[PDB]
Design a protein around this ligand. Structure first.
Ligand SMILES: CCCCCCCC/C=C/CCCCCCCC(=O)OC[C@@H](O)CO
Ligand SMILES: CCCCCCCC/C=C/CCCCCCCC(=O)OC[C@@H](O)CO
Ligand SMILES: CCCCCCCC/C=C/CCCCCCCC(=O)OC[C@@H](O)CO
Ligand SMILES: CCCCCCCC/C=C/CCCCCCCC(=O)OC[C@@H](O)CO
Ligand SMILES: CCCCCCCC/C=C\CCCCCCCC(=O)OC[C@@H](O)CO
Ligand SMILES: CCCCCCCC/C=C\CCCCCCCC(=O)OC[C@@H](O)CO
Ligand SMILES: CCCCCCCC/C=C\CCCCCCCC(=O)OC[C@@H](O)CO
Ligand SMILES: CCCCCCCC/C=C\CCCCCCCC(=O)OC[C@@H](O)CO
Ligand SMILES: CCCCCCCC/C=C\CCCCCCCC(=O)O
Ligand SMILES: [Zn+2]
Lengths: 119, 285, 107
């Protein structure tokens, strides 16, 4: 079976940075593109971007170009998403979703909750 | 460009209707229900690139060749109008076969429904080329014997239509029936053995050899058999799985045998036509 | 960017009934559309892709249709487990977009 395992919930301070981990198993990592989706509480899904593990190239949504950076560790079949200069707007459940030739998503990670709090 | 962006996919993640050859492991197009995406893929590297281009370049070759044939001076014909018609029927079969084939291969990844429809056109195209090829060759072989020319035109038409009817069957498209498909179309071409033996009995060995028929027919029999054999047995991808995904798999080689086979056929029937011009319409023989 | 307009925003229906969720794309998306179901707290799961292809393991109750800019998701004979949020997604043009969502409640 194909499984996407993300890191646990993160509680951060404003202006900080986080790196979300996506551990993929059950298929050849380089073969399919990895996407990142954001979901704000009570809101709909937003597309952050797509990453190509084979080429190493990435396509970012204009909204998240300054916010997100996609990295990869080919050896351990892991995708990473770093979020910089965090604000209260960035409090969301972040997902990793895998493509199958075209960008429709059969496989999704369980989601990583990012809470921005100065408390 | 950023519209209809897609990546090649391994065989294991393909839907059922897209699994025709499990020896082609990687480099497949994923299902895309856009004709725009499908036609753009002609300029992309995948399992169907070779299959598409062989019968696309082949389609224009027979179109250009068929056009030039119509504009040849009738000074060189013994009945330019009815002559140009027999060749025309061969060209009609050859163009439709190659047109239906490259179109099928382009829109193969679209959807199950579109794939089913274009596969039936693809199979029907094969039968049209076999029926069409019989029309010129016969007219010249049985020029002085109209009764057997007439029956053999009826026999190949009954068989060819039957083959077209068989091609409408769903089970025919399945990979289990790869050999059934090979045998049906092989039997359609090899049915020519009966008219050939009848010809040899009536005319004799010297006649058949001097006219050049024995030679050209043996080449036809060879291209038909080898092409069918490669297709049915999946050679050479059967020996090297995952090494012939893009270039030189069985289907690609088979598509090449069709282009060469139709051209060799044309060469032979063009020669019979020239032989008829020398001896003329009259037959005191 | 292509905008995805999903309607209705929310609805409540009884078990055994039929529901229809519509989606409208701001431009032609050439059948590159997917439908997802999301359970409270859980991750979304694909129901339908390529506008009408039913994903593996998904009940036949779910059916996707439409072309061009108008797409639809139909759920015949509603079951108690059908409650949750539904989303459409286009993957024709980048950046990829999701509809606003439809909240389905069962009675
Ligand atoms: C059968 C034609 C024989 C001669 C060859 C001509 C081929 C010329 C190439 C054409 C490529 C056109 C591709 C574009 C076709 C668009 C149709 C489509 O999939 O529509 C989906 C939505 O738009 C529905 O609203
Ligand atoms: C020089 C000759 C060129 C030959 C051109 C060959 C084109 C002939 C093929 C035409 C196909 C027309 C339809 C092409 C578009 C697909 C229609 C569809 O959605 O099919 C669904 C099924 O349910 C249909 O029953
Ligand atoms: C005396 C009659 C015999 C001589 C005349 C025949 C000449 C040759 C004809 C060639 C044209 C090919 C027609 C082929 C017609 C095939 C019809 C068919 O299979 O339809 C089923 C589908 O519509 C649904 O699955
Ligand atoms: C004058 C009347 C004579 C009638 C009896 C003999 C007619 C010929 C009989 C053939 C039956 C099969 C025996 C020979 C079996 C092979 C048939 C064939 O495909 O021909 C081979 C050629 O490709 C070789 O170049
Ligand atoms: C002078 C004689 C006529 C020569 C021109 C022949 C042109 C080609 C003729 C017939 C092609 C064979 C029919 C094959 C047509 C496509 C298959 C079909 O009928 O599909 C039904 C679908 O809805 C199910 O998926
Ligand atoms: C008189 C016609 C026969 C001679 C011409 C032969 C070449 C054309 C052969 C086959 C064409 C396809 C027939 C197969 C019938 C289905 C056509 C189709 O898919 O229509 C599109 C609609 O589904 C959506 O609008
Ligand atoms: C389940 C049944 C199908 C299994 C696969 C059979 C593969 C046969 C097809 C092509 C390779 C052999 C072709 C070359 C060797 C066969 C000899 C021949 O000339 O036969 C042709 C016709 O008389 C046959 O009707
Ligand atoms: C492309 C359309 C034509 C399809 C042809 C299908 C019919 C079978 C073809 C070939 C069978 C083998 C040739 C048949 C050979 C017949 C005997 C003959 O004249 O040969 C003896 C000479 O060596 C005397 O010098
Ligand atoms: C006049 C053409 C000369 C033929 C030589 C070309 C190679 C052999 C051709 C046809 C033999 C039939 C066997 C293959 C049919 C299956 C193809 C398919 O189902 O797509
Ligand atoms: Zn082919």
């Amino acid at each position: 079976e194909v499984l996407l395992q993300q890191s646990g919930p993160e509680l951060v301070k404003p202006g900080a940075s986080v790196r979300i981990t996506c551990k993929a198993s059950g298929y050849t990592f380089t073969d399919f593109n990895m996407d990142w989706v954001k979901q704000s509480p009570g809101k709909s899904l937003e597309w952050i971007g797509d990453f190509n593990p084979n080429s190493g190239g990435s396509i970012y949504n204009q909204k998240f170009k300054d916010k997100a950076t996609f990295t990869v560790d080919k050896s351990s079949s892991t995708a990473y998403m770093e979020l910089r200069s965090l604000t209260f707007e960035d409090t969301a459940v972040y997902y990793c979703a895998r493509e199958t030739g075209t960008a429709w998503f059969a496989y999704w990670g369980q989601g990583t909750l990012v809470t921005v709090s100065a408390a | 460009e950023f519209e209809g962006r897609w990546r090649v996919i391994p065989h294991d993640v393909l839907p059922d209707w897209l699994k025709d050859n499990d020896f082609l492991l990687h480099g497949h197009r994923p299902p895309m229900p856009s004709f725009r995406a499908c036609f753009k893929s002609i300029f992309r590297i995948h399992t169907e690139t070779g299959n598409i281009w062989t019968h696309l370049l082949g389609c224009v070759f027979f179109l250009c060749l068929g056009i030039f044939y119509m504009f040849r001076p009738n000074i060189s014909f013994v009945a330019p109008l009815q002559e140009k018609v027999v060749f025309g029927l061969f060209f009609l079969g050859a163009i439709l076969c190659l047109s239906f084939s490259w179109l099928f291969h382009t829109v193969y990844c679209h959807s199950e429904g579109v794939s089913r429809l274009f596969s039936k056109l693809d199979y029907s195209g094969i039968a049209l080329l076999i029926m069409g090829s019989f029309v010129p060759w016969l007219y010249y072989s049985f020029y002085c014997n109209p009764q057997p020319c007439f029956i053999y035109l009826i026999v190949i038409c009954v068989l060819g239509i039957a083959a077209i009817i068989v091609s409408q069957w769903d089970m025919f498209a399945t990979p289990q029936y790869r050999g059934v498909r090979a045998g049906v179309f092989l039997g359609l071409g090899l049915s020519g053995i009966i008219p050939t033996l009848h010809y040899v009995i009536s005319e004799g060995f010297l006649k058949a050899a001097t006219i050049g028929q024995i030679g050209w027919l043996m080449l036809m029999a060879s291209l038909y058999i080898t092409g069918a054999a490669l297709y049915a047995a999946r050679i050479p991808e059967r020996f090297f799985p995952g090494k012939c995904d893009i270039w030189f798999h069985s289907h690609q080689l088979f598509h090449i045998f069709v282009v060469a086979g139709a051209f060799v056929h044309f060469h032979g029937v063009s020669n019979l036509q020239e032989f008829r011009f020398m001896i003329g319409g009259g037959c005191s023989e | 960017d292509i905008q995805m307009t999903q309607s209705p925003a929310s609805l409540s229906a009884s078990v055994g009934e039929t529901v229809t969720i519509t989606c409208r794309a701001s431009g032609n998306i050439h059948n590159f559309l997917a439908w997802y179901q999301q359970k409270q707290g859980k991750s979304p799961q694909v129901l339908v892709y390529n506008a009408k292809t039913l994903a593996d393991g998904v009940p036949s109750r779910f059916s996707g249709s439409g072309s061009g800019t108008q797409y639809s998701l139909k759920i015949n004979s509603l079951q108690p487990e059908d409650f949750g949020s539904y989303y459409c997604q286009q993957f024709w043009s980048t950046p990829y977009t999701f509809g606003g969502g439809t909240k389905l409640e069962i009675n």
